[PDB]
Amino acid sequence: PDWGYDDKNGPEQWSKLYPIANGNNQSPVDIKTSETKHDTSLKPISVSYNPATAKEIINVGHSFHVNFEDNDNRSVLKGGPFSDSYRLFQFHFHWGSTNEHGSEHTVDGVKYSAELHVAHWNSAKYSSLAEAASKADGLAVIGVLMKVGEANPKLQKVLDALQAIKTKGKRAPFTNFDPSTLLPSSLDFWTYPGSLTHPPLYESVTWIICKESISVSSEQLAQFRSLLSNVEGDNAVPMQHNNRPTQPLKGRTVRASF
Ligand SMILES: CCCSc1c(F)c(F)c(S(N)(=O)=O)c(F)c1F
Ligand SMILES: [Zn+2]
Incomplete structure (x- = not known):
């Protein structure tokens, strides 16, 4: 593709092909907790996913994705800031080249070692992901900051599949x-x-960023970095990182449920 995470094709240069990279609603961001606004109309987040919707795992060159069947409402996110139901379609991670950085969101400047994204589309309003993906209210993504520490057993089926x-x-x-x-x-x-x-960088996502981190070990992080960005039979090129730097808030308000 015309984009990646290298020096030449990476985040700093994305605006050349994708001008919205310099937009007013770009992600990720640094959440400054003294500038959050507690909002009492925010309902609790409700997830209800059916494990029979898991479909396929794919290496996409810059990351890997776990995609889900999204033909119906078997797996849905509701509550929080939403009045609409959002249908699960994918989860994936971001990581960095060492444990020091790797999350996309930061909290009060603190970089975590990776970040989980659980992505959903608005099936109350739209008929498909493809339709939803460019709408301001199209997508809902849960992000969970991953803090290097004890191995996390819940990652196992994912890691074993790599x-x-x-x-x-x-x-x-x-x-x-x-x-x-x-x-x-x-x-x-x-x-x-x-x-x-990452491209196409559409400003279509309501972000739900969890306050609590989950763990990951330094060896489970290495399993992500040992995926290869090349195709089979080419020179092996490890997937060292795929996190974008934080972007300017431009007047947006980050709301807290707590
Ligand atoms: C156009 C159809 C969506 S492609 C996509 C995506 F699904 C994500 F969840 C994300 S993310 N990493 O914001 O969750 C992303 F960057 C994407 F480019
Ligand atoms: Zn992501």
């Missing part, structure tokens, strides 16, 4: 999996209107 999708474009069945098992036990959150965090 050996079948080592290189760009490989894909395999990934079934019977409920990604609510990856979320932290408190679902207290921050929410703000923003964007996809």
Whole structure:
């Protein structure tokens, strides 16, 4: 593709092909907790996912995705800031080249070692992801900051699957999996209107950022960085990082549920 995370094709240069990279609703952001506004109309987040909607795991060159069947409302996110039901379609991670950084969102300047994104589309209003993806109210993404520490057992099925999708474009069945098992036990959150965090960078996402982190070990992070961005039979090029820097808030308000 014309974009990636290298020096030449990376975030700093994305605006050349994708001008919205310099938009007013870009993500991720730094959440400054002294500038959050507690909002009492925010309802609790409700997730209800059916593990039979898990579909496939794919290496996309810059990351890997776990996609879900989204033909119906078997797996849905509701509550929080939403009046609409949002249908689960994918989860994935971001990571950095070492443990020091790797999250996309930061909290009061603090960088975590990775970040989980659980992505949903507005099926009350739209008929497909493709329709929803560019609408201001189209997408809802839960982000969970991942703090290097104890190995997290709940990552296991994901990590065990990586050996079948080592290189760009490989894909395999990934079934019977409920990604609510990856979320932290408190679902207290921050929410703000923003964007996809890589091209096409659409400003279509209501972000739900969990206040509590989940763990990951330094060895489970290495399993992500050992995926390869090349296709089979080319020079091996590890996927060292895929996090975008934080972007200017431009007057947006981050709301706290707590
Ligand atoms: C156009 C159809 C959506 S592609 C996409 C996406 F689904 C995400 F969840 C994200 S993210 N990483 O903001 O969750 C993303 F950056 C994307 F580009
Ligand atoms: Zn993401």
